[PDB]
Symmetry: C3
Subunit: 314 residues, 3 copies
């Protein structure tokens, strides 16, 4: 599978520093090397150089809107670039606010994509519903066409154009959703599988129904936005907003292996990895190793084993 | 959902002190506040004042029969009182022996109730089969009509009248059952889902079959007697008789969410929480937080999110 | 169930010392006593006395071939002996290389047996595909008829005769398979349920399909070769090659309970238990206790409870 790696060291979408290091710790663990060994042609586009934003003043309750907005704006352009070069875009970043740029950029080249959002949260608060002002909890609001009129013009996002419909997205792993978010979620009739649905149906059925919903009418590019907090903190503790009772390591690997086999993975986000947020060094390694294993599975790594098309015994 | 909280600080049904504190640690964690914030009208009936029982002498192998018996007798009256006030009875207690009083009291106002017993044990030993004499392991024996003649008249339980049939109870989570208990269990044809059944069927099917069995012929009030040791000690370690390989946090929350949605929850017991039995302070907090999360789910708290009936965006 | 215990204190199939102690730590934990208390007639054949092998020189990359080979050769004879005495053979050992002797010996008396291999690995490397030379990772290669011509004559295994077909074996729990192994696995059309299959289908369906495949046409003796690393290291950490994301304790007990109920268990291997490989004493106890619980379940121990055919209340 042909890949284009983009590093997004940015953390202004949220209050806990350390997420900007996600790209480095992930590369440090050998992500590019590991992909190569696998069935992959990898190209590194480097880490996006996010410059200073002068009057980066809070817009009402919304914090660092200009920084976050500009950051996503640049990412969007970079992703659009890799999608034009015929490669799957692989974004390694800080907070999830960056999904605004990743998906928007991706939608420019492939406007018919479907989104799979693995997270413990919906990240669908609007600048009007958010109680914290942190943009990593509002990305989805800026991308949905349905909310095109329910969202203020926030400084830094003038370039944004809702690129996806509420029917072109599926959530998996929800377990900490705000009342404001739940209202929108239900109201817009968005497809979701909270941990409740995962418990009831099992991850196999969950994946079956997720893919049926998105690709039923016709095949289309798939964008996987993966927030490492979607998994239980026992596997990914080094992250900003961990919530107990999440996806197990196995379910995380099952989700990606499934997506891989569709042959339609077109964009991937590996977000919220914060190397500074571990209670111990081990917690950091565990989290990084899990993030890597998840990425590798998106690109072919199977638990049953792997091999190319030829004779091994000679 | 309208609630009536009753505190049952009693631990004489078993040998490990500290369970009497269950009510306090649970209230301390903010259980009443949390319920209020939720969709609930809560009323506190306080903690039952269990007085001294003079000749509280062991009846054969049976320990503290008079204390345990009197304790349940008082609880029964209190529960009956809250059920008459049109409220769901919420018992926070010490050992599970108290289920004798909770269910008996509940059955007085709603004789057609069905019981769901989440426990790693059957607690169905009789004063004749028990090898320990501890009453927290025999509650079910005193409540079943089928055993009305297979149980001696124990000092302190003269007031007891078997109120439920073997066909009106379902166990979930069994994994440590005595030979004497298994004989009764099988013999009486009682419906059960041991961890074996949970593994085979999955918690979704388990809940489906549990509810179908109990409410198939007709709807009826549901009593959930929850022994925190039903869950794996990795989630509820601060408890007297922990057994490995139990319900996960997710399965525990799935069980309650399901029961909540039936709209028939009429009585609830949250037992065996022992703040003194943790290997570390954290183990105590973990256990208490889990007990609370379980209770909250019984009364509406959903993992997919919550909100009331109105317009949020204004 | 009638049992014949054979101790196999050998570790030359792999590089990490300590596995030879498996038999002792398992007996120390009270395995024989526990089986007796259960529904079992146990007979101890003692620990096979593995003598020194002079020129135990490496055959190419293959290490300790003569030792490993002779060890399995002796085991085979002992197992054949217990199968002739009408008993289920219970092998407690060191590394998995011993499966060569256990299965070969078993096949001599019951040539129609079917094998269930619970492991995180396929242990199917050939002396030609192995990159380490360790025989505990190649047992399956020496037992398969299909590979009768794809395997060199290794010093110490002249006595070996491929006794099982690729269609008479089922793997459960795979998650770390070498490219060379995957090629063979797929090529020979061997039935397997990697953790991927376990995640998708659930352990209940997995067991159903495993047993249907092996006993569909006709009933036949079942041999369970259990590598403790098949389970997740969180339950069996004291083992040589642990891999994350494995079978849970519950799934491990579900697998054995199922096999037990077929009434066809005819041979059992409990391998790779290494008392010296724990990070803490507790990790060693945990691993040993889990190995025991698994064995007990193979012989009748049920989570729902147990009892014999008579009247308990008198
Ligand atoms: Co999140
Ligand atoms: Co997120
Ligand atoms: Co219990
Ligand atoms: Co109990
Ligand atoms: Co192994
Ligand atoms: Co093995």
């Amino acid at each position: 599978r042909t890949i284009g790696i983009i590093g997004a060291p940015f953390s202004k979408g949220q209050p806990r520093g350390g997420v900007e290091e996600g790209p480095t710790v992930l590369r440090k663990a050998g992500l590019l090397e590991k992909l190569k060994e696998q069935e992959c042609d990898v190209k590194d586009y480097g880490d996006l150089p996010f410059a200073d934003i002068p009057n980066d003043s809070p817009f009402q309750i919304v914090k660092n809107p200009r920084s976050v907005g500009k950051a996503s704006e640049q990412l969007a352009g970079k992703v659009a670039e890799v999608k034009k070069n015929g490669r799957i875009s692989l974004v390694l970043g800080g907070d999830h606010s960056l999904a605004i740029g990743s998906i928007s950029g991706h939608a420019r080249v492939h406007p018919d994509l479907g989104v799979i959002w693995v997270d413990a949260h919906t990240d669908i608060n609007t600048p009007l519903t958010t109680t914290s002002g942190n943009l990593h909890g509002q990305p989805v609001s800026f991308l949905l066409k349905e909310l095109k009129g329910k969202i203020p013009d926030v400084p830094g996002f003038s370039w944004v154009t809702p690129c996806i419909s509420a029917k072109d997205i599926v959530y998996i792993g929800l377990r900490d959703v705000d009342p404001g978010e739940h209202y929108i979620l239900k109201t817009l009739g968005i497809k979701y599988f909270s941990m409740t649905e995962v418990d009831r149906l099992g991850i196999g059925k969950v994946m079956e129904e997720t893919l049926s919903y998105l690709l039923g009418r016709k095949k289309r590019p798939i964008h996987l936005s993966f927030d490492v907090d979607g998994l239980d903190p026992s596997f990914t503790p080094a992250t900003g907003t961990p919530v107990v009772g999440g996806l197990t390591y196995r379910e995380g690997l099952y989700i990606t292996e499934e997506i891989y086999k569709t042959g339609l993975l077109s964009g991937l986000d590996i977000m919220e990895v914060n190397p500074s947020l571990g209670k111990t060094p081990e917690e950091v390694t565990r989290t990084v190793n899990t993030a890597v294993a998840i990425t590798l599975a998106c690109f072919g790594l199977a638990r049953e084993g792997n091999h190319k098309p030829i004779d091994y015994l000679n």
